[PDB]
Design a protein around this ligand. Structure first.
Ligand SMILES: CC(=O)N[C@@H]1[C@@H](O[C@@H]2O[C@H](CO)[C@H](O)[C@H](O)[C@H]2O)[C@@H](O)[C@@H](CO)O[C@H]1O
Ligand SMILES: [Ca+2]
Length: 226
């Protein structure tokens, strides 16, 4: 989907940042082999499965540089540390093993081709565009209905990095859904953006992430090129 669908909320003053939900990702019993839970690889773990784990927090206004690398002191051990400031979540959590979901809308600054590059330990699955992530101003009623991943990265597999090159209009807000998991040990998340004119990758998404309330009618995009 080189031409993803965007949305036109036409809201007075849009809310900055994405929404985030954190969930437990416990280790297997302390004599299991391997030590980590393999659920994160089940096809429905990112859709239904994470809901069977403990909710840690629902957070709003996630904006900034969301990238991090966490070096675990040791493996097969649940250890506590903190996320970067952009996450709006200040208390220590199990950085060695956890599940994290982000959702909202991406707003381009400049119309044209955008390349989002991702890499992750252990997993990062990205949906992008109306329908694919969720429907315009109808997130709640389409929350679990996301399509094929527009990018996906799994540590240790023959696709440990991925990118997505899409033509975007600055006039639209694009549904986005980012699902992360760390199963054990080190954790890492990299999202960068490359546009055709700007020389270097963008890593600070402060001005690009937004949240909008759902509306009865929805808010389909009012820019189209057919
Ligand atoms: C493959 C494997 O299990 N490696 C062990 C380490 O755990 C993995 O580490 C990688 C990072 O290199 C990654 O984060 C993955 O999610 C982890 O499961 C770790 O357990 C280490 C113990 O000191 O030993 C490796 O065998
Ligand atoms: Ca890991």
């Amino acid at each position: 989907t080189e031409f993803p669908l965007g949305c036109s909320p036409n809201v007075t003053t849009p809310k900055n940042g994405l929404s985030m939900e954190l969930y437990s990702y416990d280790y297997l019993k302390s004599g299991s082999n391997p030590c980590w839970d393999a659920a994160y690889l089940d096809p429905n773990y990112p859709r239904t499965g994470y809901k069977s784990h403990r909710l840690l927090a629902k957070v709003e206004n996630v904006a900034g540089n969301i990238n991090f690398y966490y070096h675990a002191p040791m493996g097969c051990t649940s250890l506590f540390d903190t996320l970067p400031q952009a996450y709006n979540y200040r208390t220590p959590l199990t950085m060695t093993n956890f599940t994290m979901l982000l959702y909202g809308y991406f707003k381009p600054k400049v119309t044209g081709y955008h390349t989002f590059t991702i890499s992750a330990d252990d997993l990062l699955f990205v949906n992008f565009g109306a329908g694919n992530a969720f429907d315009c101003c109808k997130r709640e009623s389409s929350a679990d209905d996301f399509g094929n991943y527009q990018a996906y990265a799994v540590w240790g597999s023959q696709t440990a990095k991925d990118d997505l090159t899409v033509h975007l209009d600055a006039g639209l807000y694009y549904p986005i859904r980012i699902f992360f998991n760390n199963r054990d040990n080190d954790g890492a998340l990299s999202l960068t953006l490359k546009t055709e004119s700007d020389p270097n990758p963008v890593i600070d998404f402060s001005d690009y992430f937004y949240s909008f309330d759902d509306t009865k009618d929805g808010c389909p995009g009012l820019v189209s090129y057919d």
